[PDB]
Amino acid sequence: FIETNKELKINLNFQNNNIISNIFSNINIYDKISNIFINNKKTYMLKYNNNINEENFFISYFEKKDDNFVPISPWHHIDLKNDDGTYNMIVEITKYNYIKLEIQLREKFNVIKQDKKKGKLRYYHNSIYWNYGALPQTYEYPKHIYQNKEALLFTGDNDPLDILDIGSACLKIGQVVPVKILGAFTLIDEGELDWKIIAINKEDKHYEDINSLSDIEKYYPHTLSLLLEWFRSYKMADTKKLNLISKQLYDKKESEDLIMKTHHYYLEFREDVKKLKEEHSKENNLLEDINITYYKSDSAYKPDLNIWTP
Amino acid sequence: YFIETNKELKINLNFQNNNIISNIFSNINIYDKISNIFINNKKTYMLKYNNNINEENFFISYFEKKDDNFVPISPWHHIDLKNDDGTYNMIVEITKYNYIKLEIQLREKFNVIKQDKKKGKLRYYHNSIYWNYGALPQTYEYPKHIYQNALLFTGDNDPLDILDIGSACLKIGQVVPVKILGAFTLIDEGELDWKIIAINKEDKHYEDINSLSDIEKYYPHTLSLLLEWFRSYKMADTKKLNLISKQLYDKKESEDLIMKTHHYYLEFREDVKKLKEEHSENNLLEDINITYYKSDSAYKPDLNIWTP
């Protein structure tokens, strides 16, 4: 029972209400603990370690080298772009779910774990309406500075690039799904740019008919308006403030050029990390209107030695 | 505890290690005491929280001052719809940032406010609502009246829903004077559910906001969220987006909606009294504009709705 220091109390019994149903009745996972799939003519495996809502639950990925399954990182070792020309997204939250999973950059082999707020396992406030994940071999490296009295400076989220599937079908937790890029939008808070890639599943019923942000409204109306407003508000119950979203949306080609730049950023972090371990081991309403452009590469920036890299 | 997914990966289901309870209840806003006295429209009322939340007989009873005693009253029938100030009274059923689906029960004695029940279990919203939400008294979307554009539409068969875009969080059960700003329409599943957009009397920008277009200057994106929130809030269950008419009502078209539905309410109460002495893609549906059509005179009011 929750004690409100007011005379009306709250019983807090979870057997008479639909909270548990609301959150978990849309879970979409692989059938078995160890699950083998084939991506880009190669064979890999996803392993569910421990149980959901446990504080050391993680999703491990392996590759079949010979007769054995060797451990791999989904950030480093799964191919960003397929031979088809499509990209692989790593589904971390399935459609309609609330469980805030993330690829842990600071964990060995970058396993997928649940985020933790205030010391407690994090759940979304609202049900997300799209399959949500990250692109491999991408990185919003904060070494690079963006710009717009005197200018305002912006950096990256310091995590891999976020990606959205507007597909109808609910994907699975941890699944690697080939996806086609459609566009992108940006969240600008805390002074850093958090890019969100909008993409469509390879196997969606309208894959070939949708090729830009404007083709969606003909087959899946309002996903673009809903997408922005969802990310605008999804934390309003705790922050009591709306997130800032730039008025400028990227088209399909501006988004594919974004994925590459962040891949090159990823290949500069990995270089900076090897050099650094031989060195010392051997209102704001029109703040949304601004147009942001590259500025300079801070050479006083030191890469995070906490993030695991092979 | 463990949730059955009929698969090998299980769910611990412990509520002490996660932020679910925090997400839902950390923004509850209620009156301090069980019995609370308030003054609305120069009259004196009392509010009684009966029972505890998440129990199967929790309800909010309302009383009025009939000299010498406090008499039971219904918030739907006996609270004044429009005040002498020119303001309307909203009866808050869902607090800002909260999930608990409370409703005025038309089929319950004195129309007490109880928690809704879905599939036999106490109903909670899927997402946190971002505005104070309630209903207008002495209003009724009477299904006797049919609308057209052929395709026919009827009423919600419930009192008019109203939204407060005010910043301040109101209280569960609170009766709040509000100024009307506009309205939007939902067209499922063949009936019109009008949603009135209004602002709290006591909001810091009360006098600066007098239309739906004034909101973006003090509370940006409130109007876009309103449409999208109600568009999807049951999508996790229905797997489909709700339909919302493309036409938004201005301040005067909404006040004419409130009064039109008030006349509907003053026709339901008379028609029920007359009946009881005799005993011995969808894109278009959003673009379509609806107009009135005929009053089905073979319609008999619902005798389950409690009436004094």
Author numbering:
A (entry chain A): 37 to 184, 190 to 323, 353 to 380
B (entry chain B): 36 to 184, 192 to 322, 353 to 380
Give the published text:
The enzyme inorganic pyrophosphatase (PPase) catalyzes the hydrolysis of pyrophosphate (PPi) to inorganic phosphate (Pi). This is an exergonic reaction and can be coupled to several unfavorable and energy demanding biochemical transformations such as DNA replication, protein synthesis and lipid metabolism. Family I PPases are Mg2+ dependent enzymes known to exist as homo-hexamers in prokaryotes and dimers in eukaryotes. We report structural and biochemical characterization of these two apicomplexan PPases.
The final structure was refined to highest resolution of 3.2 Å with Rwork/Rfree of 0.22/0.27. Overall, the PfPPase crystal structure showed simple domain architecture, typified by five stranded β-barrel β4 and β7-β10. The first 36 residues of PfPPase are missing in the current crystal structure and thus the structure extends from residues 37 to 380. An interesting and a key distinct feature of PfPPase is its N region (residues 36–76) that stretches away from the structural core and is absent in both T. brucei and S. cerevisae PPases. PfPPase active site showed electron density for only one Pi molecule in two (B and C) out of five subunits (A–E) in the asymmetric unit. In structural comparisons with TbVSP1 and ScPPase, this Pi molecule in PfPPase closely corresponded to the location of Pi molecule of the bound PPi that is not directly attacked (P1). In the asymmetric unit of PfPPase crystals, four chains formed two non-crystallographic dimers, and dimerization of the fifth monomer was mediated via the crystallographic 2-fold axis.
